[PDB]
Design a protein around this ligand. Sequence first.
Ligand SMILES: O=c1cc(-c2cccc(O)c2)oc2cc(O)ccc12
Ligand SMILES: [Zn+2]
Lengths: 161, 47
Amino acid sequence: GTILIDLSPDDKEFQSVEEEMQSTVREHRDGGHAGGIFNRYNILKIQKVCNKKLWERYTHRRKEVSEENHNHANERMLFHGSPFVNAIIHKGFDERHAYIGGMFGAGIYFAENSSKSNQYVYGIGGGTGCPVHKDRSCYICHRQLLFCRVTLGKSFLQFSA
Amino acid sequence: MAHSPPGHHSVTGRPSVNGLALAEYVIYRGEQAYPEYLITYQIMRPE
Ligand SMILES: O=c1cc(-c2cccc(O)c2)oc2cc(O)ccc12
Ligand SMILES: [Zn+2]
């Protein structure tokens, strides 16, 4: 029962989300191999995802983690990019959306850099790029990311090379 | 799907070499994320 509501680009909610997307772009060590060569996006549309079942599932778990961690859910807004975003918004995150090969274990990954999530929109390491041109730097085809509310709780700190 | 480090609810990967790379996070329950916004976009070719 997901319905999607288009935010108007005049809406302060739209602008705020766009700002968090544009300002968290960075350069990547792969020279653009996986996600393309770019400094910014052209944002074509932003939609609020409303699903009641899924939301109650989120906040019930939130309350659990909260109580296990000095009443601090440690809630963030973070990016997630994958070929499966249409399933995610209808059916919820689960094991299908996990990154088995991942550096920090087989779980669901999220990025503070929008440009990091962008590298996964067409698969691990960009896969073979956009479906229509097979181009990992395609400037034409429409891409899709999620901006998600994530409960971290007590988070294990793992420095990385 | 793997498990959380005992006594923790998530992992934070803080890059230590690239001082401009921000954090990446991993969770191990689907119930710990809610996909609030769907952004449709193009990357832009630099001038
Ligand atoms: O958004 C991401 C999606 C995914 C991802 C990877 C594999 C399968 C998948 O459905 C999503 O991986 C990431 C890894 C990161 O270090 C940071 C962000 C992502
Ligand atoms: Zn294309």
